[PDB]
Amino acid sequence: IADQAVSVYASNEGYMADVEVKKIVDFDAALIAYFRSEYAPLMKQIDETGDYNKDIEAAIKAGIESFKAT
């Protein structure tokens, strides 16, 4: 669930209207790797529940900035 969750988050946050057209999907997959490596407890927790909390999206955007840095 977190996969498409973070994808749509990035889209709505305009986090995609900024990066390369073709590189979109590459960024996506590398983002999945980035997070499920670093944030594996985070996505585990969120997908085990299906509920969202604001601090969760805070962690999400933190990961957003960290991966955009990478």
Binding site: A30, A33, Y34, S37, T70
Partner: protein, 52 residues
């Protein structure tokens, strides 16, 4: 101005080295984890094949 220019040259050189280090470490860790997980996956696939 010349003294300040050399100072900022060194200041940016150090940052360039640091960022190169960060990139080279991060990418290598990601690739290594990639390889690890691929090996585990295909091994498990092999045992499943033999169960078949």
């Amino acid at each position: 101005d010349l003294a300040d220019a050399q100072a900022q040259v060194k200041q940016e050189l150090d940052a360039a080295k640091a960022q190169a280090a960060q990139l080279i470490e991060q990418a290598n860790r990601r690739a290594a984890q990639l390889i690890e997980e691929a090996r585990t996956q295909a091994a498990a696939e092999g045992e499943r094949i033999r169960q078949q």
